Design a protein around this ligand. Structure first.
Ligand SMILES: CCC(CC)n1c(Cc2cccs2)nc2cc(C(=O)N[C@H](CC(=O)O)CC(C)C)ccc21
Lengths: 295, 340, 61, 226, 232
């Protein structure tokens, strides 16, 4: 390796722990300490996005010391199964909150007279109870297939996703590729399509119903949401699939060292999305800015 | 003389004589008398219960005579009877007109009244053989909206309306038996005497009048406010009453002296008063305000003795049980609370 | 002829209002205080009552 | 509760049923449109606006499976400020004004024509404290009188500072702009204008379009995007 | 108010029978309903109970798993599915309405009944002096006893009194040991303390002759005591 000599990764991981914790602390606090006379059909979705994000980074320093040394692990085996569970579960919970928030907006704007009943049965508290449940049911192998394995001797012990627990030889490859693929189609691809389609019909409803200041502000925000999400979560999912494909793609050593080299930075990119998520949804509301700033 | 010149000046001298007579019988203020007595300490009350189920603003409530049941009216066209001990709903009565602004409870427990923005007072029968609640009588003789209604007995009720009139009815026949006239602006509230032989009302012309139920016309008139009067209540003794107006002040009036007694105001209060109620011993005066919270006043020294915060909108209703056990407050956020 | 009925009833109402008895404020002030001290003990809000006598005691649930 | 008697569980179940009924019936009252119908004296509100379909007076009608409720408070004749906050959550306000009135003077005051106090009533209602973010639908009725009155008696009688072609279109546009300029919010409230007279339909359709626009904007502001 | 029952008659052992009642004249959908049994020359015996809204259903130990109760709200009809029978269920079956809220009086209207001649921890309530000779114009006292205390922690005392005149249906007299029913003379009165109860009746008339029962409602199952047949 040694291209990370100049180890910003321990520095970047620690830095994200600062902005990613206090940013969602304000959002979480002001939601539960505010009056209930507003109930603007979104506080449930905004609060869930903070919970799915606050814990997503609360475990960050545990992996900051991991890469600071030469792949050490002084925190035992139990944490290696519990540290990974809190990251994968909240990686699926946030990307589900964004999709649920986007579908709630479609039912209320495009046709608010024909979808009035449909917005009552499946929405609100009903939808927030299935994204949390399905998130846990999809990050189950991280608890099961995690054991502090070894290397030459792992004098600096390491934590990785053990793969021989379930399947024997000539079969562990499926549990490596098949498990990883399921984290992409459901983790990224399917939720991204829903937000892409839902926001296009909302797009051709503000242009056809609006002065020229609210028509310019609302169309510019919508283009940011569909670009920021796609720009931040794509590099992580693209390399993993590139590295996973190496099992069948006979990539020489001239390339495999590049994927492992740049992967730690890809994880850093996805973290800044959680830093600006409170700004794009909760704080970009004048009636919400005056809530926490006064309090 | 054909012209009405001399008769106009007659009322000017008559008003002066009453003013002069009132001054001649003012020996000392109430503060000078109740000065050496020990002041009441800080009054702390907590929300024992919280009744929920209304889906719009709450405009009135009334306590039952057994100190356990109460009725509540809201702008979603519903009347609900609560069980304050266990927080249970005994009845739910739908209304034909959803613009209700008042409600009352019969002193026997068999009947409930309603009305508002329809010039019609409706009487409901609670003890029914077929097991439901039905409307029995529908009194309709007013030309303005209904402000208040108070039961006299099982067959008599007195109402005040926005057409500057109050009427005493006969529910058996449905015809007005007495009409009380003399107010200039709309009448907003009335309070019944403990012995049910007199009553008082407050109107929008910043004045209050004392009526005689049996004979049926005014006896005394009280002035001193500077805006509309929205609330009135009777001292438990029956020889005084308190008014709450729109100039962020409350006052205490005495029938036997026709004088001002006390004023309950502070600099940091600028919103009006919507409700007024008394304590069993007549020592604590409770008042609701538009600043979203209620206040407790020491009626003998005018000092403030507590605050009832916990409502997220205007406080519009306020009542104290017959035994003085608890206090209920309603508000525009559709929540009732019991404080003990 | 124009307004004689209204001017004849306002005077009638106001004339009798001077024919009532008035007591002194100090006498009226004392009677207001003597009523409170007479049975101030029966006030559950002025003097808090023990939780055994409270029907609105905050139970476990 | 494990300490309740046999006659308290039944009461609790009764309360549960009462609550279920209240909740079920409370969500049917949020799917209908409430319109507070105002206007001026002899402004033709009852002629067409209250006739376009089939104390306080209430009217119900349905157009394209949407439920409307109109509340007429013309006959109240009391202090307006004591009951104006009851209609604090209405969807919109309908205003009816007869523009053939610029020559006709008030039946009680001969100093000014009734159009001036019509404008005064519009100003008072539009800039109310309780209607900060409630839109207004404006109707201009009996336009079949206006052009033939203007071809003889011009707009100079009502507006002496106006300078135009003294035709129907220019005078109507000037009156419409004069009425629309009374708005002082301009960001949380919008005004919709229409010329009605006595025409076949084209009034319920206008009201339906305006309330659909209001509903869309309200939902968009409530869901977060504003 | 009216309650008419139909579906009686003889039944060979092992068969099944259909029982139904029709309610007309009151809001049937807000009143819990019971079935009460009376064998020839014996006392009363509670059978079942279905609440308002078909939420909670109870049964007696003798008929649990063998009798079923059903409600038909739209046409105001109460049913009783009756599976395999025996030569023991020969009795008369009544239907009683009851409503529960703060201050209500359950067991108001008792219906009429239908003959059903079949071809061939529980609280104990005891009554004595099954026959008492009485004269008009005097006063007489009736006593009923229980095994467990009926005084609940909230102050209620779930004890009821009924009267079955010769050839008639039972009617409510006193509910909760102290409250007089509706439409009954002021002569009747009741009192008790914890476990021992006494019904006081004074100035009897020709219409006061019958059998008097005491019933508890502290907890299910509901147990009926014996009776005292007043005789002229
Ligand atoms: C749970 C730990 C976090 C890192 C903080 N973590 C997340 C969740 C996220 C945390 C922040 C954003 S996302 N996913 C991960 C995937 C891998 C992984 O698969 N490593 C492979 C090793 C091999 O296959 O030999 C190949 C790589 C080296 C190219 C490792 C760590 C991962």
């Amino acid at each position: 390796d040694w291209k990370s000599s100049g180890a910003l990764i321990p520095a970047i991981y620690m830095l994200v722990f600062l902005l990613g914790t206090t940013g969602n602390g304000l959002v979480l606090w002001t939601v539960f300490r505010s009056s209930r006379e507003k109930r603007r059909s979104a506080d449930i979705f905004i609060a869930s996005l903070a919970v799915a994000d606050l814990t997503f980074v609360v475990t960050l320093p545990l992996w900051a010391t991991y890469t600071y040394r030469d792949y050490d692990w002084p925190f035992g085996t139990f944490f290696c199964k519990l540290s990974s569970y809190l990251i994968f579960v909240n990686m699926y919970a946030s990307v589900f909150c964004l999709t649920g928030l986007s579908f709630d907006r479609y039912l209320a704007i495009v046709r608010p007279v024909a979808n009035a009943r449909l917005r009552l049965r499946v929405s609100g508290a009903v939808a927030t109870a299935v994204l949390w449940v399905l998130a846990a049911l999809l990050a189950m192998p991280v608890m099961v297939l995690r054991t502090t394995g070894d290397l030459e001797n792992t004098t600096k012990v390491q934590c990785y996703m053990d793969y021989s627990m379930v399947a024997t030889v000539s079969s562990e490859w499926a549990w490596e590729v098949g498990l990883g693929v399921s984290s992409t189609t459901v983790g990224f691809v399917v939720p991204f399509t829903i937000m892409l389609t839902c926001y296009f019909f909302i797009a051709q409803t503000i242009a056809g119903h609006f002065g020229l200041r609210k028509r310019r502000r609302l169309l510019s925000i919508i283009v940011v949401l569909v670009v920021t999400f796609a720009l931040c979560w794509m590099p992580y999912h693209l390399v993993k699939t590139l590295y996973m494909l190496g099992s069948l793609l006979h990539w020489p050593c001239d390339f495999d060292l590049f994927l492992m080299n740049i992967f730690p930075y890809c994880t850093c990119i996805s973290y800044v999305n959680s830093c600006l998520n409170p700004f794009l949804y909760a704080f970009f509301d004048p009636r919400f800015r005056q809530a926490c700033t006064s309090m | 003389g054909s012209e009405l010149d001399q008769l106009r000046q007659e009322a000017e001298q008559l008003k002066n004589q009453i003013r002069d007579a009132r001054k001649a019988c003012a020996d000392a203020t109430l503060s000078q008398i109740t000065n050496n007595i020990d002041p009441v300490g800080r009054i702390q009350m907590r929300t024992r219960r919280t009744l929920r189920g209304h889906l719009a603003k709450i405009y009135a409530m009334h306590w039952g005579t057994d100190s356990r049941l109460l009725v509540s009216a809201s702008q979603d066209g519903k009347l609900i009877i609560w069980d304050s001990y266990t927080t249970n709903k005994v009845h739910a009565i739908p209304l034909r007109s959803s613009w209700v602004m008042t409600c009352a409870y019969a002193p026997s427990g068999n009947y409930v009244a309603c009305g508002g923005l329809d010039n019609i007072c409706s009487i409901y029968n609670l003890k029914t053989r077929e097991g439901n609640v039905r409307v029995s009588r529908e009194l309709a003789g007013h030309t303005g909206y209904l402000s208040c209604c108070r039961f006299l007995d099982d067959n008599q009720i007195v109402t005040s309306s926005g057409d500057t009139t109050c009427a005493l009815w006969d529910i058996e026949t449905g015809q007005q038996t007495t009409t009380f006239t003399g107010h200039t602006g709309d009448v907003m509230s009335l309070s019944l005497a403990p012995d049910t032989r007199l009553f008082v009302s407050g109107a929008c012309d910043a004045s209050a009048k004392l009526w005689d139920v049996r004979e049926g016309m005014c006896r005394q008139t009280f002035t001193g406010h500077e805006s509309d009067i929205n609330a009135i209540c009777f001292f438990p003794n029956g020889n005084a009453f308190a008014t709450g107006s729109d100039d962020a002040t409350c006052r205490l009036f005495d029938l036997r002296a026709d004088q001002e007694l006390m004023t309950y105001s502070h600099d940091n209060i600028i919103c009006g008063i919507t409700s007024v109620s008394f304590s069993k011993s007549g020592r604590l005066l409770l008042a609701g305000y538009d600043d979203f919270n209620c206040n407790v006043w020491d009626a003998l020294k005018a000092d403030r003795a507590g605050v009832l915060a916990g409502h997220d909108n205007r406080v519009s209703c306020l009542g104290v049980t017959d035994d003085g056990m608890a206090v209920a407050t309603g508000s525009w956020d559709s929540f009732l609370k019991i404080w003990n | 002829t124009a307004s004689i009925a209204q001017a004849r009833k306002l005077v009638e109402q106001l004339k009798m209002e001077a024919n009532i008895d008035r007591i002194k404020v100090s006498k009226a002030a004392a009677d207001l205080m003597a009523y409170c001290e007479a049975h101030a003990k029966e006030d559950p809000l002025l003097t808090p009552v023990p939780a055994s006598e409270n029907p609105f005691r905050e139970k476990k649930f | 509760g494990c300490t309740l008697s046999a006659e308290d569980k039944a009461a609790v179940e009764r309360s549960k049923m009462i609550d279920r009924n209240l909740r079920e019936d409370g969500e049917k009252a949020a799917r209908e449109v409430k319109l507070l119908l105002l206007g001026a004296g002899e402004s033709g509100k009852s002629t067409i606006v209250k006739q376009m379909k089939i104390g306080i007076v209430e009217t119900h009608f349905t157009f394209k499976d949407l439920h409307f409720k109109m509340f007429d408070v013309g006959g109240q004749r009391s202090e307006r400020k004591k009951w104006i906050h009851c209609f604090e959550g209405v969807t919109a306000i309908i205003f009816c004004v007869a523009l053939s009135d610029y020559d006709l003077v008030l039946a009680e005051d001969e100093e000014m024509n009734r159009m001036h106090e019509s404008m005064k009533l519009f100003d008072s209602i539009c800039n109310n404290k309780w209607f900060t973010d409630t839109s207004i639908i404006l109707f201009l009725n009996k336009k079949d009188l206006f052009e033939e009155k203007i071809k003889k008696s011009p707009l100079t009688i009502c507006y002496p500072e106006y300078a135009g072609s003294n035709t129907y279109e220019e005078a109507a546009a000037y009156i419409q702009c004069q009425f629309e300029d009374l708005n002082k919010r301009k960001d949380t409230k919008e005004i919709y204008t229409h010329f009605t007279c006595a025409t076949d339909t084209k009034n319920v359709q206008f009201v339906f379009d305006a309330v659909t626009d209001v509903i869309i904007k309200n939902n968009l502001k409530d869901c977060g995007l504003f | 108010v009216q309650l008419v029952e139909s579906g009686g008659g003889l039944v060979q052992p092992g068969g099944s029978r259909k029982l139904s009642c029709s309610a007309s004249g009151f809001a049937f959908s807000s009143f819990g309903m019971h079935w009460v049994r009376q064998a020839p020359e014996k006392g009363l015996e509670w059978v079942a109970y279905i609440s308002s809204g078909s939420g909670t259903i109870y049964y007696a130990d003798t008929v649990k798993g063998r009798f079923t109760i059903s409600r038909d709200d739209p046409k105001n009809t109460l049913f009783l599915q009756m599976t395999s029978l025996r030569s023991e269920d020969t009795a008369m079956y009544y239907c009683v309405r009851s409503i529960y809220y703060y201050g209500s009086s359950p067991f108001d209207f008792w219906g009429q009944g239908t003959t059903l001649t079949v071809s061939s921890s529980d609280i104990v309530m005891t009554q004595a002096t099954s026959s008492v000779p009485v004269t008009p114009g005097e006063s007489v006292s009736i006593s009923c006893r229980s095994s467990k205390s009926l005084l609940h922690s909230n102050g209620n005392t779930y004890l009821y009194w009924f009267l079955q005149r010769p050839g008639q249906s039972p009617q409510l007299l006193i509910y909760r040991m102290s409250n007089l029913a509706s439409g009954v003379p002021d002569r009747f009165s009741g009192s008790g303390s914890g476990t021992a109860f006494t019904l006081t009746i004074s100035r009897l008339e020709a219409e006061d002759v019958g059998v008097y029962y005491c019933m508890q409602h502290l907890e299910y199952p509901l147990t009926f005591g014996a009776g005292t047949k007043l005789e002229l």
